[PDB]
Amino acid sequence: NSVHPCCDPVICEPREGEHCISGPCCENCYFLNSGTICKRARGDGNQDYCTGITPDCPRNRYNV
Amino acid sequence: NSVHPCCDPVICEPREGEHCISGPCCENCYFLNSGTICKRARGDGNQDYCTGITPDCPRNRYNV
């Protein structure tokens, strides 16, 4: 198929000015605001939140 | 010009099986053996060495 629209194929980094390529916490090449819920929990209210600085969805650190 | 031969443009990561894209300590998409000198010093013998796990040339930590 083809180049990811966020990717710069001569560097294998995101195009200059963009943050990221893909991930729960990446949207149109930019990081979602930290605090954005990226996964809800079955229920303690210990939900997983975006960091604002990575594209993944970190496990909430209060989880055992 | 064109895609870096190490780059996978649908992921913006190195092709599967390769380590890296470019850097003093990257060669043909693979990490140089750790211990490989990547820069000599003007002279204490405190040279900079590749790590075996990154493509950059770290400053030797014994440097003030």
From Swiss-Prot, chains A, B:
Pfam families: Disintegrin. It comes from the Eukaryota. Expressed by the venom gland. Residues 1-64 form the Disintegrin domain. Homodimer; disulfide-linked. One of its GO terms (cellular component) is extracellular region. The lineage of its organism: Eukaryota, Metazoa, Chordata, Craniata, Vertebrata. It comes from Echis carinatus. Keywords: Cell adhesion impairing toxin, Disulfide bond, Hemostasis impairing toxin, Platelet aggregation inhibiting toxin, Secreted, Toxin. Signal peptide: none annotated. Belongs to the disintegrin family. Dimeric disintegrin subfamily. It is found in: Secreted. May bind to both alpha-IIb/beta-3 (ITGA2B/ITGB3) and alpha-V/beta-3 (ITGAV/ITGB3) integrins, and may inhibit platelet aggregation. A motif (Cell attachment site) lies at residues 42-44. This is Disintegrin schistatin. Disulfide bonds join 6-29, 20-26, 25-50, 38-57. One of its GO terms (molecular function) is toxin activity.
